[PDB]
Amino acid sequence: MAVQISKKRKFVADGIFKAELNEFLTRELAEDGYSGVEVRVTPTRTEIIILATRTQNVLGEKGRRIRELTAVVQKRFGFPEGSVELYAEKVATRGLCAIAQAESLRYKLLGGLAVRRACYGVLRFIMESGAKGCEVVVSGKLRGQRAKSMKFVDGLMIHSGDPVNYYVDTAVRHVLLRQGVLGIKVKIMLPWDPSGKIGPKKPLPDHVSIVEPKDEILPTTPISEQK
Amino acid sequence: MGRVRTKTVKKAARVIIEKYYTRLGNDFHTNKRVCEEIAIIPSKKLRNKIAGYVTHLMKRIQR
RNA sequence: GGUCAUAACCAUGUCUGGACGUGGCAAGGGUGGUAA
RNA sequence: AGGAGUGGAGCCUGCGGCUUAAUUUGACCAACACGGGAAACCUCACCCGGCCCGGACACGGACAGGAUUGACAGAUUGAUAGCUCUUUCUCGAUUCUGUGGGUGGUGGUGCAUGGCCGUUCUUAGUUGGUGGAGCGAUUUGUCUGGUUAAUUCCGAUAACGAACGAGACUCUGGCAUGCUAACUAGUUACGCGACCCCCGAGCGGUCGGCGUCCCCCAACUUCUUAGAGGGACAAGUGGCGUUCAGCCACCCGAGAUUGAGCAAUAACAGGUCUGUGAUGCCCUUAGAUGUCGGGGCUGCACGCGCGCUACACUGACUGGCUCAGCGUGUGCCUACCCUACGCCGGCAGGCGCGGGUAACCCGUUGAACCCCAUUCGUGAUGGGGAUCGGGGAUUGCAAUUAUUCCCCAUGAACGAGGAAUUCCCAGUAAGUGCGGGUCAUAAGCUUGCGUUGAUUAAGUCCCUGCCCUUUGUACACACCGCCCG
């Protein structure tokens, strides 16, 4: 397959492009409620669906932002014109968007606020929006210069086995301050299981349960119903 | 051997024998296929255990 | 209604270490568009 | 209970000490073949010389016979660095000069921090709600007993109903002549024609055997491949148990347990500022901690750790026979791969051609120990191959302190290991080779893979250590404690 690479190297090269982009965007769209991307090559076109919570701030004035970003990508990876085309998308339900929830906590913190109240505000929101449970940690300095941790926890959580891959999403964010750095971690547990999306599989968190319909009666007595 | 049945098995086993009492044999294979049909079981291996205990209960309940 | 035995020796510690303070609940928004 | 070792010898490699212009640096069960750290240059933090600015931006100054850039030859110099000086053109406002301001740093601080990891801890532990008991710190729930590998269940009960970890789950291994379908996978069947030998019945014909080309619009999918399913439950039987939870033996058959991944609360002043354009503060910044040349990290009276090869005959040596599996490969970074085949050379190697983006080509990966027959003869022997002389090749810009490889010669310790101590229970230990990682050149390392393949146990708390209850305490910096003359 000249001049392209063999099949082993083919998937690796895709991953490198997927990864560079995913950190490139995050350093200039964080405040506009970045939440990821989802790329899809289609015949004679690349689609890069720039998932973000609030499409307002994404658009800018006369679609300016989307135009700047497309011209960059068109040069960096050296594609000729008419290939890359960005599109935006609004994600419904933000309480499952750990990445964006973490970056909301970031700007609330950088706004100048205490840690407990900020964490509480983020907590109830993601719980209210619909979640099994949720957790926030903030480890680093505050009120001294020995480090500490403050854990704020509600609901259910899992930590072991393969279900961890389905039922939680996890984000990590560094946030700066004038004196030292603080580490944020957010872990949120997704609510869907049998009915809805359908997506998540049946196994329950850490006690796998059976759901059993009811009915068992008779009324029989001798009769023939001739048709 | 080792291994004592977990609480998830003994809890749900009781429910399943109670409400479908007249739908159980005293054979493993029949009681297996029944549990698959009258209820969701999230695994196959889990089913093969819960069936076997449902069977073991049904032996004593007739005494 | 019931039956089973013999214990050696074994001391001491350079050390300038621990994040805790006040009940806020609380975004609140939609020009483009098939029609028009 | 045993098996094989380590500790002894030689070598490799890391660490301490010592030396030195410098021998850079982190780390002391939970450091020490560790920093994937096998350093020629490069790396590079170190040492010794030389060059460069890539000091943004701001304000003021300079200034078109001019701000400014570079250089021939000679001297100087490791240097052909216009580096410096002699000599005198070129460039044209980009700069330069002064100040302000920064910028860079493998500089320091892991006791300012994030992130990640190790360990306590691989054992079964952990918490809140409501209610109860106490002036309260707290306690009950989280338990006398049985049972389990398990805070696993049964049961009992001032608690009741829950959560996390445990299992469940995921991956992997052992079981399908059932299903799905195969010129980048095979088989069978002939058709064969061709080769071959009577090789077998027979005669040499014919029939059959041995493989290859030939094979098909042949037949098939047992073998190879990968998807959906099925299968295993203490299910059955007999004992034993409160007859509960379970346990033991046995039938059936592949025995419910093949091995990993993932892994809680709380904690450590554990490791890492030398992965980070993660990061605080401090430091330095043109005579630079940011680049070139040449040297060092390999320097040796000692000490210690991980390993490798040996001390022979259950062997070595020389011929002959015969079996695998996981992978990997140029078209990528700035430039490079895996190699068949032909030829030349004892060998290392050279040279001419060809295939492979890969179930297609290398490669039916015709590997080692093993196996069979010669020779050696209990002898520091031909065991051992350290050390060392001379010569030939390959990589690179360069091989000196010998990069690696080959040829001939040289021929050391070592004769089974003191006091101590490590690891291991079934395709397991041990023997034995191969692939990957690092890689211009190179594994005694590490990570995976097959092949050959035992002994000994089916236990216990004796030692070492860990979990739970009861008890004692002048301990809480927690016995590595405290305290007396």
Q: What distance in Å separates the CA atoms of residue A172 and residue A136, rounded to the nearest whole number?
A: 10
d(CA A117, CA A111): 13
CB count in 10 Å sphere of residue A140: 17
**Which own/partner pairs from A136-140 qualify as long-range (CB within 8 Å, at least 24 positions apart)?**
A136/A105, A136/A184, A136/A185, A136/A186, A136/A187, A137/A183, A137/A184, A137/A185, A138/A182, A138/A183, A138/A184, A139/A182, A139/A183, A139/A185, A140/A180, A140/A181, A140/A182, A140/A183
Q: Which nucleotides of D are covered by protein (CB under 7 A)?
A: 112-116, 147-150, 152-154, 163-170, 230-236, 244-248, 256-257, 261-267, 269, 278-281, 328-332, 357-359
Question: If you ran DSSP here, which 8-state letter would residue A137 be given?
Answer: E
CB atoms within 10 A of CB A102: 22
Task: Give Cβ neighbours of residue B56 (< 8 Å, ≥ 6 apart).
Answer: none
Instruction: Identify the helix (H) or strand (E) that includes residue A71.
Output: helix A64-76
Task: Tally Cβ neighbours within 10 Å of residue A226.
Answer: 3
Tokens (6 digits) for A93: 């339900």
What was the elucidation method?
Answer: cryo-EM
What are the tokens at A159? 């930590």
DSSP state, A146?
Answer: S
Residue A139 phi/psi, 5° resolution? Answer: -120, 130
What's the full length of chain B, in residues? 63
Residue of A nearest to B20 (CA): A216
Resolution of this model in Å is: 3.5
Distance from CA of A201 to the nearest CA of B (A): 8
How far is A168 from A134, CA to CA, in rounded Å? Answer: 9
3 state SS of B11: helix
